[PDB]
């Protein structure tokens, strides 16, 4: 599974790599990417008000630690045709820290 991460290290990764396109809090706005509030336990393509690709909506998995850990390593391999332009976070410790941050920040 996915080892526990450091939320402060994960917050720094989020601001430097994700915040350009995403907010996390309840009521945060959509940007190039969807607001991520309520991410854990919900299916792909479900944030109210955001226009997703068919690729994202078709994936149909439930976001959680394990699916995020795979996705964030290589987004386009996990969801071919997604419009999220993000190379990938290769290091497992960095993915784990970011995931820990998301688990709290999107609660």
> Cα torsion at 69, 21, 38, 46 (round to 10°)?
-90
Q: Is 18 annotated as a binding residue?
A: yes
In the complex, the smallest distance separating the C-beta of residue 44 from ligand HEC, rounded to whole angstroms, is 4
Q: Give me the DSSP letters along 2-46.
A: -----HHHHHHHHHHHTTTT---STTPPP-SS---TT-TT-BTT-
Binding residue for ligand HEC (CB under 6 A) from 37, 73, 83, 94? 83
Residues in region 8-67 near ligand HEC by CB under 6 A: 17-18, 20-22, 32-34, 44-47, 52-53, 55-56, 63
In the complex, the smallest distance separating the C-beta of residue 33 from ligand HEC, rounded to whole angstroms, is 3
In the complex, the smallest distance separating the C-beta of residue 8 from ligand HEC, rounded to whole angstroms, is 16
Nearer to ligand HEC, 3 or 80 (CB): 80
84 exposed, middle or buried (CB, 10 Å; 0-12, 13-18, 19+)?
middle
Nearer to ligand HEC, 56 or 97 (CB): 56
């Amino acid at each position: 599974g996915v080892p526990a991460g450091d939320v402060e290290k994960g917050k720094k990764i989020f601001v430097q790599r994700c915040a350009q396109c995403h907010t996390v809090e309840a009521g945060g706005k959509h940007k190039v990417g969807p607001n991520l509030h309520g991410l854990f336990g919900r299916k792909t393509g479900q944030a109210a008000g955001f226009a997703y690709t068919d690729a994202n909506k078709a994936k149909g998995i439930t976001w959680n630690e394990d699916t995020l850990f795979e996705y964030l390593e290589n987004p386009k391999k996990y969801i071919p045709g997604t419009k999220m332009i993000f190379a990938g976070l290769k290091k497992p410790n960095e993915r784990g820290d970011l995931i820990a941050y998301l688990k709290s920040a999107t609660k």
